[PDB]
Amino acid sequence: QVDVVVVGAGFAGLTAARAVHEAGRSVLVLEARDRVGGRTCTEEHHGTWIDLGGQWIGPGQDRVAALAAELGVETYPQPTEGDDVVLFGDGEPQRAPDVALAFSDEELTAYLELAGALEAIAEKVPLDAPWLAPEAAAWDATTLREWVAGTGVPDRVAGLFEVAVQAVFAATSAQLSLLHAAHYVHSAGGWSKLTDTEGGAQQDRLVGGVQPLAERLAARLPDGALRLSTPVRGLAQDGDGVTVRTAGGEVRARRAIVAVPPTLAGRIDHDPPLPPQRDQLLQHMPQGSVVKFHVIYDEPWWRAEGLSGTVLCPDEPIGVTFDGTPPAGTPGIVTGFFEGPAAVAAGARTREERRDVVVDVLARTLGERARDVRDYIDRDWSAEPWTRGCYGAHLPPGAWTVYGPALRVPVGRVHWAGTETAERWTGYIDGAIESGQRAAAEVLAALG
Amino acid sequence: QVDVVVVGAGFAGLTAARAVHEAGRSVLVLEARDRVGGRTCTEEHHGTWIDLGGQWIGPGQDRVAALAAELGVETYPQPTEGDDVVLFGDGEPQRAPDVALAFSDEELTAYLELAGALEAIAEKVPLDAPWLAPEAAAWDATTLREWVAGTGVPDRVAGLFEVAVQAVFAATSAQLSLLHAAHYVHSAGGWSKLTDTEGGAQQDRLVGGVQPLAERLAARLPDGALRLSTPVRGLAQDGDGVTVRTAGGEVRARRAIVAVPPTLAGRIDHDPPLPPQRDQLLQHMPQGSVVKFHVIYDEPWWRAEGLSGTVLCPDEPIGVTFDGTPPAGTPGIVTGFFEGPAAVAAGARTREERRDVVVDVLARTLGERARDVRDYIDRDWSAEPWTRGCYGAHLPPGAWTVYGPALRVPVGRVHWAGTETAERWTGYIDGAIESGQRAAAEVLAALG
Numbered sequence: 001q002v003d004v005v006v007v008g009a010g011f012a013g014l015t016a017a018r019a020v021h022e023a024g025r026s027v028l029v030l031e032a033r034d035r036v037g038g039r040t041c042t043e044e045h046h047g048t049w050i051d052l053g054g055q056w057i058g059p060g061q062d063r064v065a066a067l068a069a070e071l072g073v074e075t076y077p078q079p080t081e082g083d084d085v086v087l088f089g090d091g092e093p094q095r096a097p098d099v100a101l102a103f104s105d106e107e108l109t110a111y112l113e114l115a116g117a118l119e120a121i122a123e124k125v126p127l128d129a130p131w132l133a134p135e136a137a138a139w140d141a142t143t144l145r146e147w148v149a150g151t152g153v154p155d156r157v158a159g160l161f162e163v164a165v166q167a168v169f170a171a172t173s174a175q176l177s178l179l180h181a182a183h184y185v186h187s188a189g190g191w192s193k194l195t196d197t198e199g200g201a202q203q204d205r206l207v208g209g210v211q212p213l214a215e216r217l218a219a220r221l222p223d224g225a226l227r228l229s230t231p232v233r234g235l236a237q238d239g240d241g242v243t244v245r246t247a248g249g250e251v252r253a254r255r256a257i258v259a260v261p262p263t264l265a266g267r268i269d270h271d272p273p274l275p276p277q278r279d280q281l282l283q284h285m286p287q288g289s290v291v292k293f294h295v296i297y298d299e300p301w302w303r304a305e306g307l308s309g310t311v312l313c314p315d316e317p318i319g320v321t322f323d324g325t326p327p328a329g330t331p332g333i334v335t336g337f338f339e340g341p342a343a344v345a346a347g348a349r350t351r352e353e354r355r356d357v358v359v360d361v362l363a364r365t366l367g368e369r370a371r372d373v374r375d376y377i378d379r380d381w382s383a384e385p386w387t388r389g390c391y392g393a394h395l396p397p398g399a400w401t402v403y404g405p406a407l408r409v410p411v412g413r414v415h416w417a418g419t420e421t422a423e424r425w426t427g428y429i430d431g432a433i434e435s436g437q438r439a440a441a442e443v444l445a446a447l448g
Numbered sequence: 449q450v451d452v453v454v455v456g457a458g459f460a461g462l463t464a465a466r467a468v469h470e471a472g473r474s475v476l477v478l479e480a481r482d483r484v485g486g487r488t489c490t491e492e493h494h495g496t497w498i499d500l501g502g503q504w505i506g507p508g509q510d511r512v513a514a515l516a517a518e519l520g521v522e523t524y525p526q527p528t529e530g531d532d533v534v535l536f537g538d539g540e541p542q543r544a545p546d547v548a549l550a551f552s553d554e555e556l557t558a559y560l561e562l563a564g565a566l567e568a569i570a571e572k573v574p575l576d577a578p579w580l581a582p583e584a585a586a587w588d589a590t591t592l593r594e595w596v597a598g599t600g601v602p603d604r605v606a607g608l609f610e611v612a613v614q615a616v617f618a619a620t621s622a623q624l625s626l627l628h629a630a631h632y633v634h635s636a637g638g639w640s641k642l643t644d645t646e647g648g649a650q651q652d653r654l655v656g657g658v659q660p661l662a663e664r665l666a667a668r669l670p671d672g673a674l675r676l677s678t679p680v681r682g683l684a685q686d687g688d689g690v691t692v693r694t695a696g697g698e699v700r701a702r703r704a705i706v707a708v709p710p711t712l713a714g715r716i717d718h719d720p721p722l723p724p725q726r727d728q729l730l731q732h733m734p735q736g737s738v739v740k741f742h743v744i745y746d747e748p749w750w751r752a753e754g755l756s757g758t759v760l761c762p763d764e765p766i767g768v769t770f771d772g773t774p775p776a777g778t779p780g781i782v783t784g785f786f787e788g789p790a791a792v793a794a795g796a797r798t799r800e801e802r803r804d805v806v807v808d809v810l811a812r813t814l815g816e817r818a819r820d821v822r823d824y825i826d827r828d829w830s831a832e833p834w835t836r837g838c839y840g841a842h843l844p845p846g847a848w849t850v851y852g853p854a855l856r857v858p859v860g861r862v863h864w865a866g867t868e869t870a871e872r873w874t875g876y877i878d879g880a881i882e883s884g885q886r887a888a889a890e891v892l893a894a895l896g
């Protein structure tokens with residue numbers, strides 16, 4: 001017997017359980033994995049931390065900054081200095097201190113028009129009810145790719161825009177409804193907030209990585225509250241409480257918080273069954289496709305050449321890269337992503353085949369010293385059974401307006417959390433925490 | 449240990465099991481419901497059969513026609529005589545000998561070039577590998593809605609077309625990729641095949657309903673081979689065979705056929721985990737949304753007025769209606785559907801609210817005598833835990849080309865069936881049967 005069972009020890013699950021323990025209520029956290037952090041995962045390699053999942057926090061992300069300060073974790077800034085390389089479908093790799101300077105006069109004007117036109121739509125989309133936007137019906141009936149085609153923008157602008165879209169959504173402009181993209185932009189506070197390093201979501205990292213931050217949040221839970229290696233298979237409820245079925249136990253609670261990715265929330269045996277609109281919503285919330293990698297070098301060699309370690313390649317399998325070198329200055333790390341179709345193709349291949357593809361791109365852009373590789377570590381989040389895709393769900397056309405209203409509504413004694421339910425910074429560590437705080441409040445109120 | 453374990457006792461599972469049984473191999477069929485038939489379901493009300501699920505067969509559908517003949521189930525024609533009624537927005541209702549004769553000559557002509565153009569794309573799309581169509585990249589990056597608009601047809605014809613798209617797909621023009629819609633059309637052999645009564649998919653019905661035919665197919669198996677009320681929770685495999693975990697215990701086989709809808713196949717605890725391309729495919733194959741109803745009257749009072757009982761109302765919540773009166777000529781029945789968005793809105797309401805909306809549409813079209821209703825029977829197939837939407841799965845933009853190639857590929861000892869894996873009449877009973885025949889052939893070859 002306990003008051004609240006939380007399913008998932010992500011930042012959402014942990015946030016909710018901690019709020020509930022502090023109001024003095026009994027709480028169990030059932031986590032499928034042998035660890036906490038979920039879509040945040042940190043491993044120790046070559047005497048430093050390797051963030052295989054979520055790794056960056058930025059300005060406007062007040063909850064994860066508050067949590068990092070409170071638990072004693074310091075931040076370091078994402079290296080920003082030196083030349084970025086851009087390589088288009090044709091021509092040579094271009095060096096410039098800013099990605100923007102690679103574009104022509106007419107092209108940069110078109111890219112800022114496009115970015116401004118998109119934020120204007122974004123500001124009309126309510127964060128708590130994207131389906132109540134005044135033009136929701138037409139915006140949900142259109143892909144992001146069809147809207148971009150409609151603006152009359154040249155190919156080289158649509159090219160670099162699509163690299164940024166796949167970097168942010170882990171999906172192509174063709175998979176996303178315009179309304180989903182608009183809502184996501186609005187939830188971040190604009191396009192600059194999503195794409196920028198300095199003054200944006202990629203500004204800062206955590207010293208020791210992010211999974212350690214989660215492990216400190218877990219330490220604040222009482223002894224016996226956290227149950228690792230304990231998948232939830234079943235969730236029954238009646239007029240008196242909820243029974244959670246695991247591999248060979250039942251837990252009884254008054255109320256429940258499900259804090260898993262949408263695709264996984266639908267895989268649980270609900271009794272009674274979930275109402276129709278909520279089951280179909282989960283079927284219309286597919287997770288993205290990403291393979292995150294780190295290429296390990298003895299030194300961050302590109303710094304001496306005046307390079308940032310950032311390359312941008314619209315016509316390549318690798319979208320975008322960052323200097324991932326820790327504050328000590330060694331080892332050298334180049335961090336990068338396969339996004340969307342490129343992630344699905346590379347997930348079918350071996351780690352070693354994926355290493356060869358990454359190093360070929362870097363040799364052509366950063367230079368020949370990209371081949372002196374000390375190690376290669378990557379992670380296909382589509383292959384993780386307890387995530388089934390990063391960064392989080394996108395919604396294709398027709399999904400927000402028809403099924404979307406069932407996103408947060410509790411079903412009897414069962415409440416929903418996870419970053420996909422957040423109003424602000426949806427898809428980010430920040431959004432997960434907001435979601436944990438909301439769900440804890442609804443539950444604390446209802447127990448009363 | 450048996451030769452083959454089949455998951456699902458729909459037409460796909462029962463066809464695969466009977467073909468494995470005829471070839472001399474041991475077979476077990478595990479079904480979650482207390483009945484066979486899946487998306488076909490027949491109940492007795494008012495001294496006749498009510499098809500709550502699939503009810504129609506037509507010319508072209510040679511697998512269902514041969515099964516009905518072999519197990520001795522008779523057909524009767526869908527009634528067609530009498531004036532159809534068409535109603536447009538605030539306007540008054542119009543009688544004509546046929547639906548198509550309430551449209552100007554230039555309108556009827558725009559409609560048939562549109563159908564014609566769709567068929568032209570359809571015939572370029574290979575039935576077994578739509579991802580290999582010559583403009584596959586371009587047709588998978590586009591909605592059917594964007595193709596209808598950029599065709600440039602007029603407004604009152606795109607609205608007639610939307611009714612038909614929703615009758616066929618149980619999903620709007622905006623939710624479907626052009627490649628998915630084209631494949632479907634090829635699969636059925638053209639647009640008249642999908643839409644027409646005489647000469648198409650709604651030509652014939654089965655005396656006594658469709659579930660009894662599924663029962664006669666099930667009776668070809670030995671005692672103990674079919675297990676009802678036995679949902680499959682787990683499917684594990686190794687180098688020597690497969691293990692099925694159910695509430696009751698375990699079943700071991702050499703090979704498995706999974707013949708459930710794509711959404712439910714993904715909810716099985718697979719061990720090892722499914723490969724990422726196949727898990728993410730299932731996340732991108734959501735079921736349609738449909739509520740199917742039969743309005744019961746003492747007599748088919750509309751025939752006495754020279755009406756067919758078919759209404760087309762492009763602006764109303766219900767799609768097309770049919771005369772569902774059986775051959776004895778009583779009771780009077782009007783059959784129809786809420787499709788896509790209107791099915792989700794109606795699913796959220798009560799049986800009495802849905803009845804009121806249907807009777808209101810029929811009152812203003814067939815006449816005011818429709819309000820004196822003896823009974824109203826419907827089923828929201830979205831609310832069925834063991835289906836989760838009819839008529840079947842659709843694919844949104846970007847899914848066929850990126851995730852689609854894993855649709856039929858066996859994962860070690862686990863083979864795939866269900867109407868969604870059919871090449872011909874995908875989405876129909878006929879396609880369910882083809883998938884079972886192909887799945888049984890594949891597994892018998894892989895045993896040796």
Ligand SMILES: *Cc1cc2c(cc1C)nc1c(=O)[nH]c(=O)nc-1n2C[C@H](O)[C@H](O)[C@H](O)COP(=O)(O)OP(=O)(O)OC[C@H]1O[C@@H](n2cnc3c(N)ncnc32)[C@H](O)[C@@H]1O
Nearest residue numbers: 008010011012032038039054055056232390418419427429
């Ligand atoms: C994967 C990823 C994510 C990501 C990103 C890069 C990658 C490769 N980069 C980010 C970044 O730089 N900055 C940032 O803020 N976010 C970034 N993201 C997104 C971020 O990781 C997520 O938004 C966030 O971590 C989501 O947290 P939430 O708590 O909402 O979800 P979760 O971590 O997925 O936790 C769910 C837990 O539930 C367990 N699980 C799943 N099913 C069950 C069942 N049935 N029973 C028990 N437990 C279950 C999972 O194991 C997980 O622990």
Ligand SMILES: *Cc1cc2c(cc1C)nc1c(=O)[nH]c(=O)nc-1n2C[C@H](O)[C@H](O)[C@H](O)COP(=O)(O)OP(=O)(O)OC[C@H]1O[C@@H](n2cnc3c(N)ncnc32)[C@H](O)[C@@H]1O
Nearest residue numbers: 456458459460480486487502503504680838866867877880
């Ligand atoms: C729903 C519907 C379908 C339909 C239609 C109208 C409606 C409202 N009208 C049709 C028509 O007039 N003519 C026609 O040919 N088709 C029509 N459709 C579609 C047609 O019914 C379906 O395409 C066809 O029945 C599909 O058959 P299939 O064998 O592929 O699929 P199924 O019936 O869904 O069978 C699946 C079975 O598996 C069981 N299940 C699900 N999960 C599990 C687990 N985990 N373990 C064990 N069993 C499981 C289901 O219970 C079901 O029996």
Ligand SMILES: NCc1ccccc1
Nearest residue numbers: 167168194202337391
């Ligand atoms: N967390 C969103 C993201 C990931 C990689 C690159 C840019 C942005």
Ligand SMILES: [Mg+2]
Nearest residue numbers: 080081082308
């Ligand atoms: Mg810089």
Ligand SMILES: [Mg+2]
Nearest residue numbers: 528529546756
């Ligand atoms: Mg007629």
